[PDB]
Amino acid sequence: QTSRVLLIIDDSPEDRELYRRYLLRDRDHSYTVLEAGLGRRGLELWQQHHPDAVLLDYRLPDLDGLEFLAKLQPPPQQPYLPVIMITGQGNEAIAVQAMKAGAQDYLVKEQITPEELHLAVNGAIETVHLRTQLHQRIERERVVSQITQKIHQTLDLEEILQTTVTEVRQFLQADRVFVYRFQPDFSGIVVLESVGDNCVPVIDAQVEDQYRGEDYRQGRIQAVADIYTAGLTECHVNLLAQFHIRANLVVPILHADALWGLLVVNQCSAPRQWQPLEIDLLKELATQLGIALQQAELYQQA
Amino acid sequence: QTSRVLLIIDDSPEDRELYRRYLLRDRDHSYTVLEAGLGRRGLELWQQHHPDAVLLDYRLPDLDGLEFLAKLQPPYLPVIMITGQGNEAIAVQAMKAGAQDYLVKEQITPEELHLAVNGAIETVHLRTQLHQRIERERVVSQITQKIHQTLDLEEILQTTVTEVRQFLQADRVFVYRFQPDFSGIVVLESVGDNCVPVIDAQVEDQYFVETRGEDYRQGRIQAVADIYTAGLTECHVNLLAQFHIRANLVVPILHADALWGLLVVNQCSAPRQWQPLEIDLLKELATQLGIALQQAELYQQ
Ligand SMILES: CCC1=C(C)/C(=C\C2=NC(=C\c3[nH]c(/C=C4\NC(=O)[C@H](C)[C@H]4CC)c(C)c3CCC(=O)O)/C(CCC(=O)O)=C2C)NC1=O
Ligand SMILES: CCC1=C(C)/C(=C\C2=NC(=C\c3[nH]c(/C=C4\NC(=O)[C@H](C)[C@H]4CC)c(C)c3CCC(=O)O)/C(CCC(=O)O)=C2C)NC1=O
Ligand code: BEF
Ligand SMILES: [Mg+2]
Ligand SMILES: [Mg+2]
Ligand SMILES: [Mg+2]
Ligand SMILES: [Mg+2]
After folding, report:
1. Of A48, A96, A202, B249, whose Cβ has the fewest other Cβ atoms within 10 Å?
2. Residue A94: closest C-alpha in chain B
3. Which residue of B200, B205, B211, B268 sits with most ligand 2 atoms within 8 Å of its CB, as the best mutation to test the pocket?
4. CATH, domain range A4-132
5. Which run of H or of E encompasses B169?
6. How far apart, in whole angstroms, are the C-alpha atoms of residue B19 and residue A299?
7. Are A290 and B148 an interchain contact pair (Cβ–Cβ within 8 Å)?
8. Taking the domain B2-127, which CATH number applies?
9. From B119, which residue of chain A is nearest by alpha-carbon distance?
């Protein structure tokens, strides 16, 4: 089977073949290798087939490796380049500029062993992952921290709610995020919504659906990757599909101990396996809303 | 020109000297170089100096490279294994044992060495930041949870103080509440044995009665690494010195727009540089305490 897809860009065919053979010496992974001899073709292959790692030559006919890294645009989800510059025509200065341009590692051509190549590719892939994890931790901290500041400033509840749904949708890159407030009637209306183009907006287009909030009062969440494989009742499925909802993430909002409403995230383009980081964030945000809700009524009865 | 401390562990005096000369050629960092010809002394020097990076020769008289790594106790090792050509099998085992990179003794160039040392420090730094952020988020979440559950100030304060002292691994954290006349009084305190408790022994300082802490009220933060090198006023350093305070971190706690108190962190065993991430953590927590203060005050009325 294929475990890793790797893109080699080098105007030397024999050099590409050498890497190809060395990679086969790796007993941990099986590499599928894309080859390109020109920088522009390398860009096309990268953009089209999303290799897990890139071996990038410095001196190429159409453009040098440094120009290449500058043109290389990383996908929103993981914005770091798994690129290893390998050159027989380079120095520590080019190495520094390569590292600055987004390369993860830098190798001299003559000294490359199979094992060195393996570890450089492993290191590049792992380092990109590491930077990505750190990148998201920072963004998650910013979102949570921003809401805390708004509560502390005693900003109106809906501004806090509007900021919440907007910022959490941008972070998750989801198609729709909305707050679903319950009434004393136990009826619920979508109070607030942040929606892209993949979803049918429901803020206005909405007639009431009724439910048993035993789980949501207990603080339990619903994490559905695919509405068609979650074993939902078909009526429930029909309703979600009617709004093109494919993946569903529901987090309960608790004011006092009463169930106030729901913090809901939707993917409408395709199914989506919700990740621990994403769920933990929504939970924290839900808790903060519960705080803001309590502050609101204490201020009102003052 | 930031300073770096590197530990070289090799039983060949000529090899150690060679790498030393190679490190010095790098002009982006100034290298303090420590040397050990035996693994035992290497481990010893590692324990004492906490070097930014380690060059570990595989073949030592008393250990091999892999045996060395196993004897290490950190959270991630900035170790570069140095092995001879033909022994690349050892290199793979080394990575799985904690090493960040490896070098082939015969193909060692100064440029190559610099990249490896940079990369090792870079990678270890990233994991440390990631680990710190995960821990940092846990502390913010706990205080967020307790505020949502109860409006009990002293318990929220207690949880806060206790939690940030453990995260920072500081010698003392305490809350300094103001009186209406802007006299202060340490109301809560979490402390180890490195710092003598000041919870009942407070010397009442009245600096703030003239100033009414207006600077702190706007959001001034004090982050002093060493009270003896911070250019503090002679009377101020002596007060901190009385309580063995070496490093000082003060963040204002504000209820609404009025100064309420101070969240203070002390290092007493040694000078301590306060990191942006650490400072940011205290800033957020003071904001959280202000929120707790707001609801607790409204709860009474
Ligand atoms: C704009 C968006 C909007 C929604 C999403 C909404 C209704 C809606 N129905 C829900 C659940 C549900 N709704 C139904 C069932 C039904 N629903 C029906 O319209 C039926 C009559 C019925 C079949 C009996 C069920 C079974 C659930 C899940 C209850 C549970 O197990 O938690 C939920 C919470 C769980 C989820 O979102 O998946 C909502 C928010 N009304 C809205 O305006
Ligand atoms: C247990 C620990 C404890 C402390 C730290 C405390 C007093 C104390 N004095 C402070 C500031 C200060 N204290 C002084 C001055 C003085 N202070 C004096 O005791 C003098 C009489 C005097 C010289 C005139 C000054 C000038 C500051 C201002 C520090 C600043 O500007 O941040 C501060 C806040 C800033 C800081 O901690 O550096 C405290 C908490 N009393 C305590 O029980
Ligand atoms: F032609 Be490449 F820079 F080895
Ligand atoms: Mg070339
Ligand atoms: Mg040796
Ligand atoms: Mg290397
Ligand atoms: Mg690395």
Report:
1. A48
2. B111
3. B205
4. 3.40.50.2300
5. none
6. 67
7. yes
8. 3.40.50.2300
9. A105
